[PDB]
Design a protein around this ligand. Structure first.
Ligand SMILES: Nc1nc2c(ncn2[C@@H]2O[C@H](COP(=O)(O)OP(=O)(O)OP(=O)(O)O)[C@@H](O)[C@H]2O)c(=O)[nH]1
Ligand SMILES: Nc1nc2c(ncn2[C@@H]2O[C@H](COP(=O)(O)OP(=O)(O)OP(=O)(O)O)[C@@H](O)[C@H]2O)c(=O)[nH]1
Ligand SMILES: Nc1nc2c(ncn2[C@@H]2O[C@H](COP(=O)(O)OP(=O)(O)OP(=O)(O)O)[C@@H](O)[C@H]2O)c(=O)[nH]1
Ligand SMILES: COc1ccc2c(c1)NC(=O)CN2c1nc(N2CCOCC2)nc2c1CCC2
Ligand SMILES: COc1ccc2c(c1)NC(=O)CN2c1nc(N2CCOCC2)nc2c1CCC2
Ligand SMILES: Nc1nc2c(ncn2[C@@H]2O[C@H](COP(=O)(O)OP(=O)(O)O)[C@@H](O)[C@H]2O)c(=O)[nH]1
Ligand SMILES: [Mg+2]
Lengths: 426, 124, 423, 425, 431
């Protein structure tokens, strides 16, 4: 009942999958072989007759090296081999290769495996798709995947967790091309996309966690907490619960305007208790935003607050009532009430040997703000700098794409930027 | 003026007149009709109940039309996603094979030129 | 006309529904095992209005518990009186309504509604004489709102000569759970105008204000609000449940309270207000806006009709004196073209923890304020078509939205029309 | 014999019937079991083969809780199940539901039970019909029943005891509608109708009995005394009003104007002996009438004094002579100015343990005055206030009644008003 | 993307190619008999990129050795690691091409090239996931330049979807007196512009200048120049050969480094500069190493990077050092020298750090730059070409083998076009 299938695409998607699924096992007491000494963890784990609990998940990558670490690592018995899908060549940072040249050779196998996972669900809620914007696979193969999911599953809910690129940690120059191209093609196929900015997570790990040079493992374990807060409503039986369709209904005022901003608090050094009020106020501070942008520059269209741990509804009410009085937190004309509140009572769990401290309560806020448009403007501007000279476009054209797709993607992004302006007018 | 009227085992009665009248004298549905009126009201009851039920059945069919319309929107979404995906994939395939073939045609033209260079040498 | 069949739908419907059955089970002397352990036989003379008599000296509520999501009903099973309900009267789907009226009313609700009607129909056929139906739900959510009104419609088609009565909770930004409450409520109000006979307007706006302003509860919770709802629901059903010289039933209430069919939205009121007291002051609460469970000021309009119920030991002569004195001092807030439009009952059994109480059921033209407040929130969202695609995606036309708001603004005008009518 | 059959319709008619039949049993010596240790009481009681005496009565109420007051009451062994007609749903305060919806379903059953009683009479006088103006059953069914009795018993007299509404005890806002509807329909089918104004009864109980908030039992006990005075000469071998026909002769010169005013005295509290002159004076005090109205605003057409108990003709004539001297009692031109007097020697009787004290002499004056039209004018006014906005009309139409029946019924009451006026000048 | 097939052609090709194999074999723990005697698994994690695994737990370079002159490969077999190569992968003719491009490309070279393709196909078909090909050769002679470019285009025909990469040694009058070398280089550059994806420009002019001016070598030999070549080749292939945070491969390099297909000639740089077989008394510091990115003295092509702008840069740092400090120095050389980076390719400098330093040095830095200043190298070649071509000097050496004048005019136009488009992008504005 109420199953959610998770799909992890490319290096970023797969490595974040590792952090999340590890965290899920700890949260539910599932050992690395699937055995375990509230039934709603079944939305994310099927069960074999042997009492083995198996993630309802596919890992896909076009080259095998990252997924080979899953196949030989701690949780190598958690997944069935057929869930871990790899080709030979990767997309070489090229959307066109991830979407056509290389991606076409493995897409049917992936859809066959997903179709088998769907056959095991009695009330499939939808799909959660994890990927980066900037990679050749994360961008090109995810676009192909989303389009094929629309054919096979119609309007069945599809939500994304997307890594927005950061120069610091990036290793490709064409990332602004891959970003705009996958955003254009995926836009009409996705119901809701939770964007995560690697730069913001990088900065939070330096400031709050005293880590000089955060590694992907630092970033991914922090990203795991956010992902866990969001899916905790689906995996546990709590006081106030939020399912996939409620996320969409309450965060997405127009089909294209579907990019909520995540914020998580508290992020506390393990080597270093915050109240419901304090952690709620933290979600509206621009430093704790999982995407670099300034919400004071914009208007809120919807706030979804997801509490976990030792949190009573009275304190959330008093916390949100304070928020409603801050004039520097501005909501659009056409939104008489913008708050949706989830409370799950199992505290956040942290991986032993990790940098995050154990806390008795935490909150994750998903807000839909016009201020997200700043992150689109930053991306579009990098795209224009290169595109005005057609720098690197020959690599995409060489794989069969036309230049018309580039301008059609870029003009879709300009329309998107102008939509954010229009929904903010009074 | 007292005028006795009657006497009986458990009472008596008389009439006391205090003044005579000024003026002398006094100044001046069948079973079927009932049943037809009751039956008429009954038909008006039943006509109203039938009009209420017909409006509710009209809303049952609107609900069926709403539910079907959503199923048609889903099928047309599927149908147009599928035709656009096949169109994109075919145009890309053609384009890519055309780039590859042009690249081989140019290298083969170099190959013909090499035989012309080798011919020119023996010719002299 | 004895038996009422009670239905509670969605999260709110089941939370206040549960508290209702708790409160009146206490009054009628029923413990959670269904055993009677009370002190008087006034508690049992009309207990069959709401309870079926089982075999082993047991009383089971004639209640049907409905939701598209299993979570809330598992919580009531675990609540205080959770074991008093018939196990086969829980009817719950799995996928939820998504806070979406169109999902509860069309696609998702349609899949569960015939399971509900089979339980309704089994409860109806074991009734000697079925008085009618009593539904608790919110208008702002997806299940109670959308599926509740679908349920009302289907029950009307199958029992068109029975009274349909709802306790309908109106949303308020002050204690919201979803951003589309204005859509969900306006689509439901349209259904209730057409298909219910009597609706008690339970206004979360007013519940919140009572808790914050008179009860000094600086952060009200649903528990605080539902304590007001349960006190009100016990008060309005008093004459249904306890024997009195008024042989009150649901049709007689409609006949005497509803001068025109569309105008069947009642303002409930309660005194005294309590968190978790003389006769003359009780009668004056009738015009105290602070005591109204709908966020309307009765002195902003005119009472078409009023029912008042007094509970506790008190002089029936002193009650009728002060009722007439309130009516005369306030003559300008009653319509003069419905003579004698206030009717009073006194019942000697007070509610738990109170010695004397008063409860008012008013059909006031000031209820137009509640609907105007929903209309303005609807219009602010709908003029930008905010969140509309989640309803069109369920197959609804935009025209259903405009027709439901036109109908609600018409209701508003009709209430205005009779507020200005002179004799 | 001169049998009369009593029919009680709706809660008010049934509960007043209970109070009357209990009082008749006390007056005639009939125990609650039906046994009994002047044979005129056979006009109101039949007799079974077990030697039990049975009220010649039918009770019609569609709410079984009321009829259960009969079949489980103190006098329950007096009645046979075929006399108690009940149903599932009552008329819900709606004349149209009582007249059209319920009445079409039960009228044949009800006439069948009445026919069974009538087949036991050798000289049936007619019917005494007890009912409310304001109840949906008392108004709606009674009027259907009176139409059908006019068909099935064309030459039989029909008298009514009608409870006129008072807001103090009323439970329904639409009682003015039901009153006009049933008066319109019943008017040409009744011979003589004694209206009992609940407010007048309520005030006599408060003032004369020192009851703060009278109950229906208080009202019904006092009403039973008036009914008893009116029927006393049917059930004993009296001299005045010895058959139902004599009521129309002595009180109804004009068939439409058939609504006599009853005045009763003395009403004395049991918690606390008046002369013939005092109780005679009390007959001319509006505080003792059964309908609130001012006879100074009208003219009498007929006037009967019904004495009970220790009353001597010399004392009566003396009292009357004193009244004509000090008061002006205005009869119409065409009627003689005077009284028909009867004495019934049977002493007035009260329920043991009740609030009415037992007196040695009592009197009931029945007068046909044009003043009683004020009671119709009060009713007509409330009707007009609601009907001008068509308030509540849809509940009546929803039961198959036509809107225009409101208008027709209201015109008839205007015509009745104009009749009372034209007779009175 | 695993295996690379290496090809070395002509004298220069086989000498720098042999040095490359000695150098990386020592970095990976392989002795002249193919046996692994190293002490770290990191040396073996990506060993397959360049080596085949043989029978006796041996490792054999995936290397094809080609020359029209038969003596050069007898010199390779005579060399330190000559025993490591597969004997069947030596492909030898009987007469060199006498510094004549047309001999290598059209006549004698064409008669040997099918034998080379025999060996190429067998190394390629045995690959599980072939990345592509790297060719070492010079542009001024006859075999490496003429036959080498013939090989490239023939291999491209059978493997059109693999990456084609070269280490190409540009001639200099300071090092060779052979007068026709500007002809051979210009004819070869024409081929490389059309048929390779990545070319490292190794300039004998710059190698001589480093040896003479910085190493104070009065008369540098090829051994002195090839020491700088082998250090650079080891440096640029570091990320192909060792496990790093980036899984670098030939295609991902091209995609990120080459914004326009023809502009694929990289300027390599190295620090520190050292003489061959010389003890290094003190290492270098991180900001020291970083500064040599703009140091014309450290460039393997005789161009001043400050005379143009970088389109893209890849820098690899080798040794034990802070990656935070590396990142701070690389940010600051960019901040202060912002005028030498095109503004319209955001984030065009990418850095890697490998903890294994090359033999002999505790720390080292290698730069791979796509700079518009590389146009000074092609201008220099083009001026030397013209000075001869205007006189038709030596043209009968080439028409005697069947060539025409027009093929010379065409290659000169193509190279002067290459120069214009480096200039176009050097002057292009973001506004
Ligand atoms: N947060 C996080 N970001 C990552 C991770 N791995 C890569 N990224 C980011 O993802 C983008 C690079 O895309 P990748 O996901 O590595 O590439 P890919 O999908 O595997 O595609 P190809 O390798 O080009 O076929 C850059 O912005 C990286 O910073 C990770 O493990 N965690
Ligand atoms: N005097 C007197 N009046 C009564 C009594 N019961 C009811 N009434 C009055 O009669 C009117 C109500 O009419 P009922 O006859 O009781 O009602 P009903 O027609 O039997 O009931 P419905 O079918 O539900 O409308 C009101 O004016 C009551 O105050 C009673 O016992 N005594
Ligand atoms: N850096 C360097 N340059 C070399 C070396 N050997 C030759 N050269 C240069 O390469 C060019 C001559 O090309 P070669 O490689 O000797 O010619 P080839 O490819 O063997 O062709 P042939 O004419 O058949 O001998 C001139 O520019 C020489 O300076 C070497 O070992 N190192
Ligand atoms: C305006 O005039 C009237 C108004 C209301 C009524 C009546 C007349 N008369 C009646 O018989 C019915 N009725 C009342 N019903 C009820 N309930 C019956 C329906 O369920 C809820 C409880 N409670 C009360 C009254 C009056 C006092 C309290
Ligand atoms: C300007 O942007 C970029 C520049 C270069 C690269 C990338 C982006 N990203 C990448 O994955 C590849 N890559 C690099 N490749 C390589 N080699 C692979 C091909 O053989 C030679 C070694 N060496 C290095 C890098 C960066 C550090 C040294
Ligand atoms: N008074 C009260 N209101 C509630 C309660 N629960 C939810 N609500 C209100 O109900 C509306 C949301 O509807 P809900 O019942 O949770 O959604 P549903 O389960 O889809 O029917 C909002 O207006 C909430 O404020 C409750 O327990 N008491
Ligand atoms: Mg990858």
């Amino acid at each position: 009942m109420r199953e959610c299938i998770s799909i992890h695409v490319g290096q970023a998607g797969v490595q974040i999958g590792n952090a999340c699924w590890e965290l899920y096992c700890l949260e539910h007491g599932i050992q690395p072989d699937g055995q375990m000494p509230d039934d709603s963890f079944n939305t994310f784990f099927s069960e074999t007759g042997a009492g083995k609990h198996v993630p309802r998940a596919v890992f896909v990558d076009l080259e095998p090296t990252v997924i080979d670490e899953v196949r030989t690592g701690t949780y190598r018995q958690l997944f069935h081999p057929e869930q871990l899908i790899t080709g030979k060549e990767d997309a070489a940072n090229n959307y066109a290769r991830g979407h056509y040249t290389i991606g076409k050779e493995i897409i049917d196998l992936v859809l066959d495996r997903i179709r088998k996972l769907a056959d095991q669900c009695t009330g499939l809620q939808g799909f959660l798709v994890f990927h980066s914007f900037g990679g050749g696979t994360g961008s090109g193969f995810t676009s192909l995947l989303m389009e094929r999911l629309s054919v096979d599953y119609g309007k069945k809910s599809k939500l994304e967790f997307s890594i927005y690129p950061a120069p610091q940690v990036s290793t490709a120059v064409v990332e602004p091309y891959n970003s705009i191209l996958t955003t254009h093609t995926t836009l009409e196929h996705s119901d809701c996309a939770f964007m995560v900015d690697n730069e913001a997570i990088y900065d939070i790990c330096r400031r709050n966690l005293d880590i000089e040079r955060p590694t992907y493992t630092n970033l991914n374990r922090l990203i795991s907490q956010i992902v866990s807060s969001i899916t905790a409503s689906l995996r546990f039986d709590g006081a106030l619960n939020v399912d996939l369709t409620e996320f969409q209904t309450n965060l997405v005022p127009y089909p294209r305007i579907h990019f909520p901003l995540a914020t998580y608090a508290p992020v506390i050094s393990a080597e270093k208790q915050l109240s419901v009020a304090e952690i709620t106020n933290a979600c509206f501070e621009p430093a704790n935003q999982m995407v670099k942008c300034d919400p004071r520059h914009g208007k809120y269209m919807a706030c979804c607050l997801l509490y976990r741990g030792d949190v009573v509804p009275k304190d959330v009410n008093a916390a949100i009532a304070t928020i409603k009085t801050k004039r520097s937190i501005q909501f659009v004309d056409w939104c008489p009430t913008g708050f949706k509140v989830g409370i799950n009572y199992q505290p956040p769990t942290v991986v032993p040997g990790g940098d995050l401290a154990k806390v008795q309560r935490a909150v994750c806020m998903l807000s839909n703000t016009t201020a997200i448009a700043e992150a689109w403007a930053r991306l579009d501007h990098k795209f224009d700098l290169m595109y005005a000279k057609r720098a690197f476009v020959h690599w995409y054209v060489g794989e069969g794409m036309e230049e018309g797709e580039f301008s059609e993607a870029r003009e879709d992004m300009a329309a998107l930027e102008k939509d954010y302006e229009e929904v903010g007018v009074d | 003026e007292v005028i006795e009227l009657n006497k009986a085992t458990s009472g008596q009665s008389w009439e006391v007149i205090l003044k005579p009248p000024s003026f002398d004298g006094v100044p001046e549905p069948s079973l079927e009709e009932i049943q037809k009126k009751l039956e008429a009201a009954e038909e008006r009851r039943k006509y109203q109940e039938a009009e209420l039920l017909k409006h509710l059945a009209e809303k049952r069919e609107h609900e069926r039309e709403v539910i079907q319309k959503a199923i048609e929107e889903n099928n047309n979404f599927i149908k147009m996603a599928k035709e656009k995906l096949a169109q994109k994939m075919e145009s890309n395939k053609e384009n890519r094979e055309a780039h590859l073939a042009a690249m081989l045609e140019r290298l083969q033209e170099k190959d013909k030129h090499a035989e012309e260079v080798r011919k020119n040498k023996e010719l002299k | 006309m004895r038996e009422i069949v009670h239905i509670q739908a969605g999260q709110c419907g089941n939370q206040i529904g549960a508290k209702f059955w708790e409160v009146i089970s206490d009054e009628h002397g029923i413990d959670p095992t269904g055993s009677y352990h009370g002190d008087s036989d006034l508690q049992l003379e009309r207990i069959n209005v709401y309870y079926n008599e089982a075999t082993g000296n047991k009383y089971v509520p004639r209640a049907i518990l409905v939701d598209l999501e299993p979570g809330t009903m598992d919580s009531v099973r675990s609540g205080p009186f959770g074991q008093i309900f018939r196990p086969d009267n829980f009817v719950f789907g799995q996928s939820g309504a998504g806070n979406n009226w169109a999902k509860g009313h069309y696609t998702e609700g349609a899949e569960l509604v015939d399971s509900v009607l089979d339980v309704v129909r089994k409860e109806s056929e074991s009734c000697d004489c079925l008085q009618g139906f009593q539904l608790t739900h919110s208008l702002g959510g997806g299940t109670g709102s959308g599926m509740g009104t679908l349920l009302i419609s289907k029950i009307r088609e199958e029992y068109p000569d029975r009274i349909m009565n709802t306790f309908s909770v109106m949303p308020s930004p002050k204690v919201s759970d979803t951003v589309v409450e204005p859509y969900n409520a306006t689509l439901s109000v349209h259904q209730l105008v057409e298909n219910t006979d009597e609706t008690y307007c339970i206004d979360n706006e007013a519940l919140y204000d009572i808790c914050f302003r008179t009860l000094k509860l600086t952060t009200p919770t649903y528990g605080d609000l539902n304590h007001l709802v349960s006190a009100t629901m016990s008060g309005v059903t008093t004459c249904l449940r306890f024997p009195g010289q008024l042989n009150a039933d649901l049709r007689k209430l409609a006949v005497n309270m509803v001068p025109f069919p569309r105008l069947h939205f009642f303002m409930p009121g309660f005194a005294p207000l309590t968190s978790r007291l003389t006769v003359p002051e009780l009668t004056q609460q009738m015009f105290d806006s602070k005591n109204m469970m709908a966020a309307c000021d009765p002195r902003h309009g005119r009472y078409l009709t009023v029912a008042a119920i007094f509970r506790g030991r008190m002089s029936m002569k002193e009650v009728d004196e002060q009722m007439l004195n309130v009516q005369n001092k306030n003559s300008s807030y009653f319509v003069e073209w419905i003579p004698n439009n206030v009717k009073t009952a006194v019942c000697d059994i007070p509610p738990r923890g109170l010695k004397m109480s008063a409860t008012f059921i008013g059909n006031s033209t000031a209820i137009q304020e509640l609907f105007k407040r929903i209309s303005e929130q609807f219009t602010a969202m709908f003029r930008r078509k905010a969140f509309l695609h989640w309803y069109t995606g369920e197959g609804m036309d935009e025209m259903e939205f405009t027709e439901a708001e036109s109908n609600m603004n018409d209701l508003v005008s009709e209430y205005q029309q009779y507020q200005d009518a002179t004799a």
